[PDB]
Design a protein around this ligand. Structure first.
Ligand SMILES: [Mg+2]
Ligand SMILES: [Mg+2]
Ligand SMILES: [Mg+2]
Ligand SMILES: [Mg+2]
Lengths: 320, 323
């Protein structure tokens, strides 16, 4: 938290708003396979700009996810809308993982994210790994410009869901005192947080038999390591898609004596692995060692065979 | 809000009388309710540690039967009956006097009640009740704040109070979570408690029960009208090496399914099939349960049937409420 980082944060914040002020059309993108924080940061920024600058044309684009559609509706726009437009990307550490490839077809590109800065693809890169979520960064932006009063029910609701998504509702280690203070203020806007959380947690009945496979086929070792391996034949047995299977990475997290676990889904020509750890244990390092990365307690790796998975395992078990 | 400020003013006099009693007594003993929850532990130990930190020379004790699931929160004190002579007794989180754990609570010279449940039984000499608080732990924090002692809070105080707030809010999920609740929990996290570690310890589950939850997830039957049934045969209990009572704690495993309105979780113990009946919103199912020889509350009832053929009639009866 050096004094220089802080000064650069203020300047970056100020620069972003000038880019917003100087642009009539603002288009906001997020990552493929969106989560609540993706939807909440994108839409929250959209609604914030729309409230502060009611003449500007602000759009939120990408492929909609039916599980998240309750958060808000996305915009379908023409390729011409991008001409001399400001493009902002939320929540996306790597440019290949952005959901619409037109993010580069504009005059300016801004990145706002809370993942370690490894791909500085913006002309402006706002990165704060000390934030719980990109949603929380968006509220920090609002607070910087003393606009906390323009926050209405819509902004507060989508930003609240985004913080909740990335903290597991204030559970994970990325929840700070600042995180709780923001979420308190958001609830202050009468958003009926219980109703929102109930909607977000509601389950598609057709996915539950697969979740039961996880509960019955997890492998916990006395070491504190656990593994769940989903083969291509399993996804076929249950009629589910690999992104759908990935949403069950934390199904086993409450097991007594759990320390490190990996959730591996063979997506065909690539096994997507979600690496998770308890406490101050570190897995982000082993993730980078295999071409992956993310948070030290929540990172992702892809391998190309089950023999290479076993190496991801062995390496992870050395960390105790 | 204006209304909230008025509510805080009504309690100020009570807060100051509790503290005077605390100051006036060198021995202070704190009780909570039988079958304790996180909030019961956290409010009792929170207040104990607060008094111990503000008055290091007083003798402050937290009594009651320990619960193995919650003992990580803090250890309870074991005292002889004579310790209550001319002592101050405080009871936290306990609406009704028959539910105070240790009966020695009346053996002292003063009784104080601190609680957040509806004031139906004002069993204390002094009674502090705030139904607008999320939890008794949140009331304890408000007391600390009223006497400008927020800096006296240490890791012990913040940890136990945080767990008590988390317990009665479902970790900031229920409607009793206010903005003020969130703000307090923030301040508590600011005392460098390891909240994820504390929570992990609280949510800790037995790996043996996970397989059976999976069966439940692979053998529920949702109908288009929103009715859902889980039928557990006695052979299944044997397969997963579980007991009928254990198996009944999975009644709400499917409660988050989209479209769900009424469900029944039915377990075949050799003698009878024990059915747990549940409903969403304003749907009533306890009239149906009464019709088949059981009963309970409108949204949560139980009935025993003697055959799966009787189960089907119970089911058919339940669905008449969905039409
Ligand atoms: Mg995120
Ligand atoms: Mg995300
Ligand atoms: Mg309570
Ligand atoms: Mg209680």
């Amino acid at each position: 938290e050096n004094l220089y980082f802080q000064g650069h944060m203020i300047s970056t914040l100020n620069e972003i708003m000038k880019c917003i002020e100087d642009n009539d059309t603002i288009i906001i993108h997020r990552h493929v396979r969106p989560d609540p924080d993706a939807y909440g940061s994108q839409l929250g920024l959209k609604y914030y700009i729309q409230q502060k600058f009611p003449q500007k044309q602000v759009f939120a684009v990408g492929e909609a996810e039916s599980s998240l559609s309750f958060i808000g509706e996305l915009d379908n726009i023409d390729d011409k809308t991008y001409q001399d437009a400001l493009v902002i990307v939320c929540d996306t550490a790597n440019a290949p993982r952005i959901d619409d490839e037109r993010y580069s077809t504009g005059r300016k590109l801004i990145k706002i994210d809370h993942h370690p800065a490894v791909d500085q693809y913006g002309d402006i890169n706002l990165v704060n790994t000390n934030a719980s979520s990109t949603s929380e960064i968006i509220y920090d932006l609002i607070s910087h410009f003393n606009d906390e009063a323009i926050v209405n029910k819509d902004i507060a609701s989508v930003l609240y869901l985004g913080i909740v998504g990335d903290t597991g509702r204030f559970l994970f280690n990325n929840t700070s005192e600042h995180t709780m203070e923001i979420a308190g203020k958001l609830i202050g806007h009468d958003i009926d947080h219980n109703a929102l959380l109930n909607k977000m947690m509601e389950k598609d009945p057709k996915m539950l038999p697969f979740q039961g496979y996880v509960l019955q086929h997890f492998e916990l070792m006395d070491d504190g390591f656990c593994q769940v391996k989903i083969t291509e034949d399993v996804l076929e047995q249950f009629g589910i898609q690999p992104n759908e299977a990935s949403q069950f990475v934390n199904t086993i997290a409450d097991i007594k004596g759990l320390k490190i676990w990996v959730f591996a889904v063979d997506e065909g020509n690539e096994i997507r692995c979600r690496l998770r750890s308890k406490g101050q244990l570190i897995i982000n390092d082993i993730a980078q060692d295999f071409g992956g990365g993310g948070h030290p307690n929540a990172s992702g790796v892809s391998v190309d065979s089950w023999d290479e998975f076993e190496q991801l395992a062995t390496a992870l078990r050395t960390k105790l």
